[PDB]
């Protein structure tokens, strides 16, 4: 998955998330077209087995011909009272996309962190199934403590939790950030 954000000069915006699902998707690449095929069929539920995330059969998400599998993506545009775009944000990486999106919005809109800190700030993730809270390797360990004393058994991600690209309006203009976890940078004028 990849997310990107855009604000054009007229103040129109695009939040866009896109994916082939797993790293290198299905691992099928055409030797003729060079097209790498998605394994998006994996995002469906099966009537038989429980998924790798421990989610038991969920008939709302069973495979049907022509049907779109449930996705974790959530490309988002925050719009002001005035009709001015306030924020453009979304995330990418495994199943941590919705929690990461939430976090960046919380970080900026509520904690008041600037757009590059919203994106760089340590993250954490729980999706109920699996039944574990994963924290990033550099989370504030007071967060870790405060959760375990409330009976969360936490684990530490061995890599990182999601990749967030964001653009926030300030009175200074459009403040933009790309996630160092994946190594992008914004551009603009």
């Amino acid at each position: 998955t990849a997310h990107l954000s855009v604000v054009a000069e007229d103040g129109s915006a695009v939040s866009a998330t896109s994916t082939i699902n797993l790293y290198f998707g299905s691992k099928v690449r055409s030797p003729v077209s060079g097209i790498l095929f998605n394994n998006e069929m994996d995002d469906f539920s099966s009537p038989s087995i429980t998924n790798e995330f421990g989610v038991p059969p969920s008939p709302a998400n069973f495979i049907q011909p022509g049907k779109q599998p449930l996705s974790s993506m959530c490309p988002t545009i925050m719009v002001g009272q005035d009709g001015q775009v306030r924020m453009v944000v979304g995330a990418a990486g495994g199943t941590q996309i919705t929690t990461a999106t939430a976090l960046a919005i919380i970080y900026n809109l509520w904690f008041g962190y600037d757009v590059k800190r919203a994106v760089e700030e340590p993250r954490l993730h729980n999706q109920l199934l699996p039944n574990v809270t994963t924290v990033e390797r550099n989370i504030d360990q007071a967060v870790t403590a405060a959760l375990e004393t409330r009976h969360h058994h936490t684990q530490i991600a061995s890599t990182f939790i999601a990749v967030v690209q964001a653009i926030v309006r300030t009175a200074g203009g459009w403040a933009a950030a790309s996630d160092s976890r994946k190594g992008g940078e914004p551009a603009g004028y």
Partner: protein, 343 residues
């Protein structure tokens, strides 16, 4: 580094510096948000080939400052006509080989977004990337890790090792990647338009490739694929702002639920200034995740399952209030406490 990334006119935030620039340049050439978006995406499909590209699918949340309206473009993959509920019996099965491929929707997404919002010629959007794909670029950090992560499956796979290895060992950060075949394909797409992919000169090769790998995609799948305009995206309120996000099949409802739950605590700078407050804040945050995830398993493609009421519940203030009221400040709970639902 010679930039603080605060722009007075326009910005592109992407996960490869070069693709941010490609989109920035599209805007400077007079292109719309969408034009820049598409151009950056094509580049993203090269620089982060593991993440996304024309073999996959996407959604676009678009805000138009002229009309002051938002819209979503749904262009996620669909199951082939031949697909069925019991087609897989392990996770491995739905993860590798032809059978795990859904019908790509990327290009129809780009097309539909471009017809509605494009201002640059179609071919102009492909130009930088074709250039990039033939030229070659150094492997950036993100993709080097992906390669490392998957070195076993890549190195033992000749068709993947062709572009992704040097001397039959995965490319490492800084080494030059070139995507010759994708440049051809991108060029065909630039000239012949979206049609070439779906019902055109690439179309048989796509079927032949998927099916030779054990898949069941057929030309008819491709001919029938349509991206979808969604005139009224999901929305929630946050303060005096409004967030637009996609409905099912995406996680718009989950994110709406998560945030609607958490807005009730009136978070501020204060919530993290003492570890006591910061502790409880993060606990509540995780609880909101768990409550919203519980309801998620009720979701699916709204064309095939009536999730009207589920979605209305998930994005509603009453429902959110109802779940916040059950969050314990002193403790997390068993899975069942959240009332996960599968009907």
């Amino acid at each position: 580094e010679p930039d603080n990334h605060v722009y007075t006119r326009a910005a592109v935030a992407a996960d490869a510096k070069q693709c941010s620039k490609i989109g920035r340049d599209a805007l400077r050439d007079g292109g719309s948000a969408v034009d820049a978006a598409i151009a950056a995406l094509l580049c993203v499909g090269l620089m982060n080939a593991h993440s996304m590209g024309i073999g996959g699918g996407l959604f676009l949340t678009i805000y138009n400052s002229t009309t002051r309206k938002a819209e979503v473009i749904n262009a996620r993959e669909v199951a082939p006509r031949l697909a069925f509920a019991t087609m897989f019996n392990s996770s491995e099965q739905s993860q590798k080989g032809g059978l795990s491929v859904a019908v790509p929707g990327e290009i129809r997404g780009y097309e539909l977004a471009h017809q509605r919002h494009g201002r640059l010629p179609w071919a102009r959007l492909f130009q930088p990337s074709i250039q990039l794909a033939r030229q070659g670029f150094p492997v950036g950090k993100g993709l080097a890790a992906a390669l490392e992560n998957k070195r076993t499956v890549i190195e033992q796979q000749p068709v993947l090792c062709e572009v992704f290895c040097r001397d039959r060992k995965v490319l490492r950060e800084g080494e030059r990647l070139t995507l010759p075949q994708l440049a051809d394909t991108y060029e065909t797409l630039a000239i012949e338009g979206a049609q070439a992919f779906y019902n055109g000169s690439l179309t048989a090769q796509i079927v032949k490739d998927i099916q030779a790998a054990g898949g069941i995609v057929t030309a008819e799948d491709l001919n029938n694929y349509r991206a979808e305009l969604i005139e009224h995206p999901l929305n929630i309120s946050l303060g005096d702002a409004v967030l637009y996000m996609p409905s099912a099949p995406l996680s718009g409802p989950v994110l709406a639920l998560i945030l609607n739950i958490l807005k009730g605590y009136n978070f501020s700078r204060e919530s993290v200034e003492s570890p006591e407050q910061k502790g409880l804040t993060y606990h509540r945050i995780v609880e909101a995740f768990r409550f919203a995830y519980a309801k998620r398993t009720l979701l699916g493609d709204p064309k095939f399952v009536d999730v009207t009421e589920v979605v209305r519940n998930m994005t509603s203030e009453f429902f959110a209030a109802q779940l916040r009221a059950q969050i314990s400040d002193d403790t997390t709970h068993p899975i069942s406490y959240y009332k996960p639902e599968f009907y």
